[PDB]
Amino acid sequence: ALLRILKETEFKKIKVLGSGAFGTVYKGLWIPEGEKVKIPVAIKELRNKEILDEAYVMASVDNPHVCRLLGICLTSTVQLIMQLMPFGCLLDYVREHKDNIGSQYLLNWCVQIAKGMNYLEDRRLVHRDLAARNVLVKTPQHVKITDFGLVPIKWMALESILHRIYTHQSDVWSYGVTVWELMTFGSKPYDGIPASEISSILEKGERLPQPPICTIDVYMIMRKCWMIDADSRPKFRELIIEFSKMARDPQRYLVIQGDERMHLPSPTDSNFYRALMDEE
Amino acid sequence: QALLRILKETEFKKIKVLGSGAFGTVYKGLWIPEGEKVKIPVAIKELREAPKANKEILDEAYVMASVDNPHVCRLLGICLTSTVQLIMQLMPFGCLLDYVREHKDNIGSQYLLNWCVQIAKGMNYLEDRRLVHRDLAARNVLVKTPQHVKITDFGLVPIKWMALESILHRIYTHQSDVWSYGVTVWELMTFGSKPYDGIPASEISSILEKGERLPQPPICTIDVYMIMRKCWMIDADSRPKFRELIIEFSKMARDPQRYLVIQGDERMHLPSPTDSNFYRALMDEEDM
Ligand SMILES: Nc1ncnc2c1ncn2[C@@H]1O[C@H](COP(=O)(O)OP(=O)(O)NP(=O)(O)O)[C@@H](O)[C@H]1O
Ligand SMILES: Nc1ncnc2c1ncn2[C@@H]1O[C@H](COP(=O)(O)OP(=O)(O)NP(=O)(O)O)[C@@H](O)[C@H]1O
Ligand SMILES: O=C(Nc1nccs1)[C@@H](c1cc(F)ccc1O)N1Cc2ccccc2C1=O
Ligand SMILES: O=C(Nc1nccs1)[C@@H](c1cc(F)ccc1O)N1Cc2ccccc2C1=O
Ligand SMILES: [Mg+2]
Ligand SMILES: [Mg+2]
DSSP: OOSEEOOGGGEEEEEEEEEOSSOEEEEEEEOOTTOOOOEEEEEEEOOOTTHHHHHHHHTTOOOTTBOOOOEEEOSSSOEEEEOOOTTOBHHHHHHHTTTSOOHHHHHHHHHHHHHHHHHHHHTTOOOSOOSGGGEEEEETTEEEEOSOOOOOGGGSOHHHHHSOOOOHHHHHHHHHHHHHHHHTTSOOTTTTSOHHHHHHHHHTTOOOOOOTTBOHHHHHHHHHTTOSSGGGSOOHHHHHHHHHHHHTSHHHHBOOTTTTSSOSOOHHHHHHHHHHHOOO | OOOOEEEOTTSEEEEEEEEEETTEEEEEEEEOOTTOOOOEEEEEEEOSOOOTHHHHHHHHHHHHTSOOBTTBOOOOEEEOSSSOEEEEOOOTTOBHHHHHHHTTTOSOHHHHHHHHHHHHHHHHHHHHTTOOOSOOSGGGEEEEETTEEEEOSOOOOOGGGSOHHHHSSOOOOHHHHHHHHHHHHHHHHTTSOOTTTTSOHHHHHHHHHTTOOOOOOTTBOHHHHHHHHHHTOSSGGGSOOHHHHHHHHHHHHTSHHHHBOOTTTTSSOOOOHHHHHHHHHHHOOSOO
């Protein structure tokens, strides 16, 4: 219904964008038959036709902060088509802007990721791979969650490392690590520590260090996501409220040098961005 | 208002040339948001002739940057260089004239009538905003997707699209726009034929007073051609209103094969919901 079955003669892979746990992402072109136009798309080639049933679920998501699977091609290697995000993922974005971000942008991203994760919770889809690399930037003012519903030890809750149980509260943990990535401008969590040892350091009660720009107010939220008791860590609905609260007074909760001249887009610039690449 | 972004050079680059018109050349361009590594496709119209003049160009730019309708194009930005350059969204399918030419006979009756409805909706919106188009023609109707057209280059010599009272006097009205709307419909129904082909433009004024109009397109039933002819009546106030045209064409679009006789109209692909959602998610996320 909302998933278009494509045939191989309708799209072309052009450039490789990256590789992850399961799949390689290409920049591609959609070639509508009978037409002379070439529309850019993102294609994930993976590494059971029932997969069609899985595809229908991701084609059925409806939220401004959740990516939708647009099409699939099954003739050979399973290929999936979704809208291409020219800004790439949020992780690469925040690294390349380590010097010019701003508290207003950072806190709003936390709101948007929480909104998307709450939507997935309402639909009872567990992400199982939330991380800054799986948050796509449509525009700098608008981020979207991807590759949900399907090796990454440093984002997994303790109950996911020891036992293989992924819950919405396990997603809350990975949400906490995702915020940490943003607040550290794309730092690698537990840098230098082998993944084999992360299981053990968490039971000793060691967490990720406090980001230098974070007040304790925001750091308490992050740490609250990493509590060993899954049912005691925050709910996504609460995260929306807290971060939305902080976004109404951003300089009070994030201490960034020069935070006054690198703030939210002007309405003229917002209208220009929106008419050009974000009309939803 | 203040929906017009004043762009500076070095923020956009002209890449490919798309065409030239009465005053200006349109390029495919790239917007490079400052501080970013991204290349956003745009359409750029560089005018033809280069002070104080750009204060009225700016005043119109603010007006055209403020239109809000699904079937009316919006001016997005302007660059105030020697030659003024204008920025709007790039329509990769191009104008409706070239589209209907490259799909001659390959178009279904359902498509043709829907375009007439949408152009009328947009032209009625411009009337609601008290803006005279002054240049309605199939070349100034852009195809966003095949199911969605938008009006452009409004509110600013094309003798064969002008009402008689515009040729013999520079009087452009919403009712004179109704005339060019009729000529535009004729273009669509003839799959992009040239209007009054073979008659010199200097002589068009005289043939209209003698009562000669554009011929009936072979695919048009008598009902569709009668609307067209009412658009070209010498009495301006006797021509249809745009909202009446919306109602009329909407009625015919609910039974297109009753009003358009097209060979193979049963083998002519119609818009399927799966294809609609795919087109919209990729290039038409706007409300409609
Ligand atoms: N729709 C898209 N548009 C643009 N770039 C994309 C898109 N999807 C993915 N990418 C890029 O492709 C990279 C790799 O894709 P992916 O296969 O998801 O690996 P990953 O997400 O980074 N790691 P993993 O969580 O294990 O999949 C991402 O980091 C993005 O930079
Ligand atoms: N936004 C756009 N996206 C894509 N193609 C466009 C766009 N605007 C204009 N074009 C193309 O550029 C061509 C030339 O533009 P233009 O200068 O307006 O000439 P024209 O509209 O054909 N004649 P006229 O408008 O009466 O002066 C058009 O015919 C279209 O094919
Ligand atoms: O395709 C995906 N991502 C892509 N990156 C570049 C192009 S597509 C990914 C996905 C996309 C989306 F919009 C929303 C949630 C997701 O989980 N999916 C979907 C799916 C269905 C059946 C089997 C495997 C996968 C799979 O891996
Ligand atoms: O810019 C236009 N067309 C373009 N084609 C390719 C890129 S822009 C055109 C226009 C665009 C639109 F979205 C809606 C209505 C319009 O009248 N305008 C606007 C304007 C303002 C001041 C002086 C001259 C012009 C002028 O020519
Ligand atoms: Mg991924
Ligand atoms: Mg034009």
